[PDB]
Design a protein around this motif. Structure first.
Motif, short mmCIF file in Angstrom:
data_model
loop_
_atom_site.label_atom_id
_atom_site.label_comp_id
_atom_site.label_asym_id
_atom_site.label_seq_id
_atom_site.Cartn_x
_atom_site.Cartn_y
_atom_site.Cartn_z
N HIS A 1 0.80 -1.25 0.00
CA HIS A 1 -0.10 -0.15 0.09
C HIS A 1 0.79 1.18 0.07
O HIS A 1 0.12 2.42 0.07
N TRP B 1 -10.92 4.43 1.60
CA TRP B 1 -9.88 3.73 1.93
C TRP B 1 -10.33 2.34 2.82
O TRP B 1 -10.80 2.27 3.83
N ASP C 1 -9.67 -1.04 4.50
CA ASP C 1 -8.50 -1.38 4.90
C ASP C 1 -8.84 -1.67 6.55
O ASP C 1 -9.89 -1.34 6.93
N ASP D 1 -3.01 3.26 7.88
CA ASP D 1 -2.09 3.88 7.28
C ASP D 1 -1.65 5.21 7.20
O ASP D 1 -1.29 5.58 6.15
N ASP E 1 -7.42 -2.44 0.37
CA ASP E 1 -6.23 -3.11 0.74
C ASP E 1 -6.99 -4.64 0.98
O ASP E 1 -7.94 -4.67 1.80
N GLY F 1 -8.37 -5.76 4.33
CA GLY F 1 -9.66 -5.01 5.00
C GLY F 1 -10.81 -6.25 5.02
O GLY F 1 -11.65 -6.20 5.79
#
Ligand SMILES: N[C@@H](CSCC[B-](O)(O)O)C(=O)O
Ligand SMILES: N[C@@H](CSCC[B-](O)(O)O)C(=O)O
Ligand SMILES: N[C@@H](CSCC[B-](O)(O)O)C(=O)O
Ligand SMILES: [Mn+2]
Ligand SMILES: [Mn+2]
Ligand SMILES: [Mn+2]
Ligand SMILES: [Mn+2]
Ligand SMILES: [Mn+2]
Ligand SMILES: [Mn+2]
Lengths: 309, 309, 309
Positions: free
Chosen positions: C97, C118, C120, C124, C228, C231
């Motif tokens: 990522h 996002w 995830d 991040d 991601d 997730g």
């Protein structure tokens, strides 16, 4: 209460894998009758239908075993009309979903006002001309819908069939693998359906409230639940012929059935597509069968909060 | 903040399998204390209760080990009243749920206004006369409810017991295997419960909002969460004595506990029925124990969105 | 329709395990292109980016491979700006990522008004100074957020970076392991997020409605989905570098993506953190990859109710 009218239907020629014939047998051996008896309904076992094979049953175009699949539903229809005549809920422990043609037909001959809830990963609304596999277990709804007559060619074995249910009277729950043509029919005819996408957005609670209000809104009426075991995720019913990931959870299957029972309008039930010869291990078979029995039991009163006399 | 008052309760005579005694030990060895310390609450370990066995503990009718199960709760009650006296949340890492009798009693002696949330696959509301197994781990609530006094026979070991909680003050979450008699009590007494059927219809979000509004509506008050590990599905807590399919998901267990923490009214917690000797494999034991610790940690502030000082 | 602009990004120096480089390759070998072609969008394969290694790439404090991770995003940014220039949806099949820095930067150079979703298990959003692991795959958002400029030290490799997205323009879905510092940033900056706790309380249906209304309320605008694979729960995407229990279900991943597709505003997509060398068995790898392809396909129209031309 509400009497049960059991009907065995060990038929597998609506599809390619012969194991679904095992269905009635394994379902019985799992103690289904005594468990329904432990509950509160009269169990009248009409036995298992003997489907004499049709020696020269040549295909119709790409459609295989048309005459076997057709006479199988024909017998079943007459069988379902009798249990419904003796004032009972018809309970068909079938093989392949092609039998729904007969189950719903014989049912509608007694209560033509019935509404249908079809729990399946598939729509099974392919016609003889749209089918690509040519398996009749994925075409039952097309022979039943009134709006599709005119699109259904005269297939050997189904001259007795009269479109009994209209587009506005059926609801799908659990779809996740509909053919491009089937999707065209859903959208064109305007059939009510709750695919996994909807179950995800509404939650099974709102889904059941909406499908019941949609069918039982204007008028109360007989309910026919045709339940394809593959409507549930393969982690719960792996011993089926066409499994698809992302299906209904163990719990969601029970909610659906516990809510249908509570309407007090259940009139016919089909427990289809269970095929033990398709379980990876002996426990995969036991998992698929017990989940099928648990499902059937909720249709007749078994509630997770408990019960008592 | 809110101080923690840990209490070991390695007792297993409320049921048949002796392994639940392992509970406190495995829970500790999993690093429960340092993890709670990593969070933000004072951990005061009152150690593990030494339950001297009763040499001649003959059964009461069908009820086994009545005197052992009774003195076990009696000790625990006095123990729980002390931690609650030193101004702390009582945290009992028990064996079998029969200990809830003592946990809730000793708790109510300090805060008789407490409301109870019972997360379980079972109601554990059987009496000595309705029980069929005769295991006291499935009868704790009957000895506690005020509305059932008069129905509870005087069992050896429980002369000290005074019904401390009323029907209107307890909520069940996760039910899926209630005895016919237990169901009769639920419905007759009008006890609030959210069985799996309800969790399915409302979603855990509405369930937690409703159980908290139901208990914390009129007045705020001490909350006692009695958590039976079997309230969650066997795929998450397999090392338990009475597992049932269709249970609360890993995630739903955490929501419940994260929401209870946020009320800021947690006063007592029971982490029951964990039995490592019942895990199929060493990982089945590790899965059940870690899920139990993760659960306990959310009760004290561990949130999935994160935390910080 | 909406053209697809595929970009390979076999980079793994944003983290410790070199296998994520396998990502583009396995994703391709799984038939991703022909399946997208089976759907209804033009597939323009810009190939796989060749990231020449930086011989002397010494660490920045605790941050490793800063120059490699930085030039990797720099190349990718320029690459993403070109596909977005040829009027297409940028589709990056990356490694770690950390590449999101380049993906979102090159994207914003063409559509600076984009909003980000996002998906995830992690935020991040660590900076070079808050990071403890020093892995850049857990710091991409910090280099992107406008409100954090001033907090981001000048790290070798990122002189080209200009904070392109503001706090008010990004939404997190699926969080369950946020660092104490990351949580501080979430809450301080007021970033919209739906951790597992929220997904549990609202249900994925209300979650998607709320994140889309939050981003597409005032004005419609380009949407960048950075996905991601971690997730989702490890039972669905086990072949990833940092798996966490209690994640998004197979079904919830598809809903998210099916709803994003329907807005018709998808402009950029990242399919990150798939690492086949991390699957326990060959099927663990196949499970993680197919779920990743199924996910990507829903972003481009694949719906569970069905499709048709
Ligand atoms: N759409 C497929 C579906 S096969 C599944 C059939 B059944 O739902 O009955 O299991 C076809 O036309 O064969
Ligand atoms: N209804 C059963 C329940 S046994 C389960 C007990 B416990 O919930 O504590 O695990 C009985 O009376 O033994
Ligand atoms: N909070 C951890 C997260 S590592 C996970 C990274 B990624 O989400 O990209 O897989 C850190 O700072 O390394
Ligand atoms: Mn079917
Ligand atoms: Mn099916
Ligand atoms: Mn219990
Ligand atoms: Mn229990
Ligand atoms: Mn990430
Ligand atoms: Mn992650």
């Amino acid at each position: 209460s509400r009497t049960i009218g059991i009907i065995g239907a060990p038929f597998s020629k609506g599809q390619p894998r012969g194991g679904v014939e095992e269905g009635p047998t394994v379902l019985r051996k799992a103690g289904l009758l005594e468990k329904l008896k432990e509950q509160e309904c009269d169990v009248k076992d009409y036995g298992d239908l003997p489907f004499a094979d049709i020696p020269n049953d040549s295909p119709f175009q790409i459609v295989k075993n048309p005459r076997s699949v057709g006479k199988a539903s024909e017998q079943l229809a007459g069988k379902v009309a009798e249990v419904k005549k003796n004032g009972r809920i018809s309970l068909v422990l079938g093989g392949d979903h092609s039998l729904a043609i007969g189950s719903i037909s014989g049912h509608a001959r007694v209560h033509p006002d019935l509404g249908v809830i079809w729990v399946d990963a598939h729509t099974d609304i392919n016609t003889p001309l749209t089918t690509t596999s040519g398996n009749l277990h994925g075409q039952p709804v097309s022979f039943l819908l009134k709006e599709l007559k005119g699109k259904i060619p005269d297939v050997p074995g189904f001259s007795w069939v009269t479109p009994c249910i209209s587009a506005k009277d059926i609801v799908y729950i659990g779809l996740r693998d509909v053919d491009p043509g089937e999707h065209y029919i859903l959208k064109t005819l305007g059939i009510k359906y709750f695919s996994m996408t909807e179950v995800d957005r509404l939650g099974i609670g709102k889904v059941m409230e909406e499908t019941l209000s949609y069918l039982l809104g204007r008028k109360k009426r007989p309910i026919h639940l045709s339940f394809d075991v593959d409507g549930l995720d393969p982690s719960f019913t792996p011993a089926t012929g066409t499994p698809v990931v992302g299906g209904l959870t163990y719990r969601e299957g029970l909610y659906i059935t516990e809510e249908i029972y509570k309407t007090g309008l259940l009139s016919g039930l089909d427990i289809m597509e269970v095929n033990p010869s398709l379980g990876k291990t002996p426990e995969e078979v036991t998992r698929t069968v017990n989940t099928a029995v648990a499902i059937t039991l909720a249709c007749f009163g078994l509630a997770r909060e408990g019960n008592h006399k």
